[PDB]
Amino acid sequence: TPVSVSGGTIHFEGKLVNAACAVSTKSADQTVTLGQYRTASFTAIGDTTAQVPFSIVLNDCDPKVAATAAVAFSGQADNTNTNLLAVSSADNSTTATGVGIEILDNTSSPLKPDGATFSAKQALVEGTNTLRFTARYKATAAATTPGQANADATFIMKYE
């Protein structure tokens, strides 16, 4: 018996600015796999899947230029809960409904995906610095439907 599954990926891009730090070329164009989940196991508004880790790696940082770094995220927001990213599918596949994608900083704080809600400021050390995040699905309806649940977002660095 086939199973109904919801899952997909989120793709992140950012500007390559030679500011206080330089963003790794790997981090500035990356795809994070969120997993596949049994659709029937989403049974209530607010159900969430496991947090999937991803990183933004900064190279060649100079704390003398800027003591701290933070990140904001921008994408098309879910209409039911605008603190989540709306999900989409490829043309050959159906889109899941009743879920959005949540991004959290390393303090476990969700970030509104409006391009102006920045993560907790992190102290920089000379050279390479790792900024850690997670992503997951969050149900926006009690009854969800199966399919692909992908998103595209941009990230924005703030050095202070």
Numbering used by the authors: 4 to 163
Excerpt from the publication:
The FimA subunits of the pilus rod are single domain proteins of 16 kDa with an incomplete, immunoglobulin (IG)2-like fold that lacks the C-terminal β-strand (G-strand). In the structure of the pilus rod, the FimA subunits interact via inter-molecular donor strand complementation, in which the N-terminal extension of each subunit, termed the donor strand, inserts as a β-strand into the preceding subunit and completes its IG-like fold. In 2010, Sukumaran et al. discovered that the FimA proteins from the enteroinvasive pathogens E. coli, Shigella flexneri, and Salmonella enterica have a second function besides formation of homopolymeric pilus rods; soluble forms of FimA, independent of FimC, act as inhibitors of host cell apoptosis after pathogen internalization by stabilizing the interaction between hexokinase and the voltage-dependent anion channel (VDAC) on the surface of mitochondria. We showed that all three FimA orthologues investigated (FimAECO, FimASHI, and FimASAL) were capable of folding to an alternative, self-complemented, monomeric form of only marginal thermodynamic stability that likely represents the FimA species that acts as an inhibitor of host cell apoptosis after internalization of the respective pathogen.
FimAECO, FimASHI, and FimASAL were produced as reduced, insoluble proteins in the E. coli cytoplasm without their N-terminal signal sequences. All proteins were refolded in the absence of the chaperone FimC under oxidizing conditions to allow the formation of the single, invariant structural disulfide bond. The purified proteins were crystallized, and their X-ray structures were determined at 1.5, 0.89, and 1.69 Å resolution, respectively. All FimA orthologues crystallized as self-complemented monomers, and all structures strongly resembled the previously reported NMR structure of the FimAECO monomer. Specifically, all three FimA monomers showed nearly identical immunoglobulin-like folds, completed by intramolecular donor strand insertion in a parallel orientation relative to the C-terminal F-strand. The global folds and registers of parallel donor strand insertion in the X-ray structures of FimASHI and FimASAL were the same as those observed in FimAECO, and all three structures showed high surface complementarity between donor strand and the rest of the folded FimA domain. The only significant difference in the mode of donor strand insertion was found for FimASAL, where Ser6 instead of Val5 occupied the P5 pocket, which caused a more extended conformation of the FimASAL donor strand segment Ser6–Gly7–Gly8. The overall pairwise Cα RMSD values for the three X-ray structures were 0.30 Å for FimAECO/FimASHI (113 Cα atoms), 0.51 Å for FimAECO/FimASAL (154 Cα atoms), and 0.57 Å for FimASAL/FimASHI (110 Cα atoms), and the only minor conformational differences were restricted to loop segments 15–20, 37–45, and 89–97, and residues 51 and 81.
